[PDB]
Enzyme design. Structure first.
Site, PDB file in Angstrom:
ATOM      1  N   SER A 233       0.932  19.118  59.916  1.00  0.00           N
ATOM      2  CA  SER A 233       0.526  19.187  61.502  1.00  0.00           C
ATOM      3  C   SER A 233       1.702  18.804  62.442  1.00  0.00           C
ATOM      4  O   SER A 233       2.780  19.235  62.539  1.00  0.00           O
ATOM      5  CB  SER A 233      -0.758  18.734  61.494  1.00  0.00           C
ATOM      6  OG  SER A 233      -1.451  18.989  62.785  1.00  0.00           O
ATOM      7  N   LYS A 237       6.229  18.983  62.579  1.00  0.00           N
ATOM      8  CA  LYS A 237       7.415  18.726  63.562  1.00  0.00           C
ATOM      9  C   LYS A 237       8.305  17.611  63.512  1.00  0.00           C
ATOM     10  O   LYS A 237       9.417  17.647  63.492  1.00  0.00           O
ATOM     11  CB  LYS A 237       6.233  18.761  65.122  1.00  0.00           C
ATOM     12  CG  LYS A 237       5.607  19.707  65.436  1.00  0.00           C
ATOM     13  CD  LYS A 237       5.177  19.374  66.928  1.00  0.00           C
ATOM     14  CE  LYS A 237       3.783  19.698  67.213  1.00  0.00           C
ATOM     15  NZ  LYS A 237       3.343  21.240  67.034  1.00  0.00           N
ATOM     16  N   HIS A 373      -7.018  24.194  58.132  1.00  0.00           N
ATOM     17  CA  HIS A 373      -5.967  23.237  58.380  1.00  0.00           C
ATOM     18  C   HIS A 373      -5.970  22.071  57.496  1.00  0.00           C
ATOM     19  O   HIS A 373      -6.807  21.162  57.822  1.00  0.00           O
ATOM     20  CB  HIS A 373      -5.995  23.011  60.173  1.00  0.00           C
ATOM     21  CG  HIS A 373      -4.562  22.276  60.304  1.00  0.00           C
ATOM     22  ND1 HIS A 373      -3.544  23.015  60.451  1.00  0.00           N
ATOM     23  CD2 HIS A 373      -4.638  21.056  61.356  1.00  0.00           C
ATOM     24  CE1 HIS A 373      -2.497  22.138  60.931  1.00  0.00           C
ATOM     25  NE2 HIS A 373      -3.184  21.028  61.544  1.00  0.00           N
TER      26      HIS A 373
END
Length: 392
Positions: A233, A237, A373
């Protein structure tokens, strides 16, 4: 609905800002890659401090036969500052008990404290931050609560260790949390806040993963040549940028990382960027906010960020089921893949999005799976095959 997706022309990863083309790996390494790293440091993630010349840390705990005889467990404290009540982080390491040699390690940034990563009563309950932006000790019912996202038994079964750090020890993840984190530690004399090109929180978490690496390369039971990094998630990044900044990670795994991660921004009109910079103003640097809603065009997109891994390994993955764009993340990886060919490696190998549970690629891999997710048992099965292909 894929007919409603805007079409676009991506900035050319293998052309310089002048327009001169990048002709070989030398030219990528000496000219294009520094220019892409500089672009992202200024307009997206921000400038971070240099590596601390000496790591201040203490090995607090070392236990044999943990996890039912399956592992050696350590817990190491890394201090970001000599001061007291200063920011610091607790690294948890599990190495296989049978290990005949220093063993490969997967390093991970965790959403919960170190007691959530396995069902291990020898691990002290950690203080976590809550929905109300308070910090407080965790309840015993929470032990092993993230265990399915880490699958430690599979990793040890494969001959590998797992290392985890709770990310909010580096900087808590809410707007207003910077004061409790490492970024204030590096202010110039009488500096109140970050300049608009200074690191944001994503950059801070990435910088913490690299201090975890600093320790791993001193631990005699760890093969410092065989460490990778995983994040999910928003921490996917972070993991992308830590990989870009730190050549020691032999691969990174970026699970469902979205906008400012693997996902191609031009698949919408700048609305994800605005939502993120609005709700999570701490994540990216102050310059990033000028790209909200296409008020300025981005001189970059995510295939360029992902190419900062080349020629090292890269795994991008998505879930079918939401507020994510799996094909956007696929196309991030597929459009970065040409760079691996400059080095004689194989990338994604296709431009066609695969169907469920059909992993594609060699040095750059991708899959989409069913479900929400998350990080699941299916994901780790492919990740550990990737890791074997990457490590021999």
């Amino acid at each position: 609905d894929e007919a409603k997706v805007p079409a676009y022309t991506l900035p050319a990863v293998l052309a310089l800002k002048s327009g001169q083309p990048v002709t070989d790996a030398k030219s990528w390494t000496t000219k294009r890659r520094p220019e892409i790293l500089a672009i992202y440091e200024a307009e997206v993630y921000g400038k971070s401090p240099a590596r601390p010349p000496k790591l201040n840390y203490e090995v607090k705990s070392v236990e044999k036969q943990a996890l039912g005889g399956k592992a050696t467990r350590k817990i190491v404290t890394i201090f970001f500052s000599d001061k007291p009540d200063a920011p610091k982080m607790d690294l948890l390491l599990y190495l296989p008990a049978a290990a005949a040699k220093p063993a490969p390690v997967i390093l991970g940034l965790s959403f919960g404290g170190i007691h959530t990563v396995a069902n291990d009563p020898g691990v002290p309950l950690a203080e976590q931050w809550t929905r109300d932006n308070r910090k407080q000790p965790s309840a015993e019912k929470s032990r092993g609560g993230e265990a399915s996202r880490w699958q430690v038994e599979k990793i040890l079964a494969a001959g590998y260790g797992l290392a985890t750090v709770y990310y909010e020890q580096i900087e808590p993840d809410f707007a207003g949390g910077m004061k409790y984190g490492i970024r204030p530690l590096f202010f110039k004399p009488g500096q109140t806040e970050p300049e608009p090109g200074d690191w944001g929180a994503v950059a801070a978490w990435a910088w913490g993963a690299s201090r975890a690496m600093d320790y791993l390369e001193k631990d005699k039971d760890v093969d410092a040549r065989r460490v990778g990094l995983i994040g999910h998630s928003r921490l996917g990044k972070a993991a992308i940028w830590a990989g870009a900044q730190d050549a020691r990670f032999t691969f990174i795994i970026s699970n469902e990382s979205g906008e400012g991660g693997a996902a191609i921004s031009r698949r919408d009109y700048g609305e994800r960027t605005t939502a993120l910079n609005t709700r999570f103003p701490h994540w990216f640097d102050g310059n990033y906010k000028k790209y909200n809603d296409r008020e300025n065009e981005m001189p970059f997109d995510s295939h360029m960020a992902l190419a900062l891994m080349a020629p090292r390994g890269l795994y991008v993955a998505s879930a079918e089921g939401q507020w994510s764009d799996p094909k956007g993340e696929f196309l991030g990886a597929a459009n970065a893949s040409p760079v691996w060919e400059l080095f004689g490696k194989k990338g994604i190998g296709t431009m066609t999005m695969p169907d469920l549970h059909e992993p594609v690629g060699d040095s750059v891999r991708y899959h989409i799976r069913a479900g929400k997710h998350d990080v699941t048992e299916y994901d780790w099965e492919q990740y550990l095959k990737f890791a074997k292909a990457q490590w021999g």
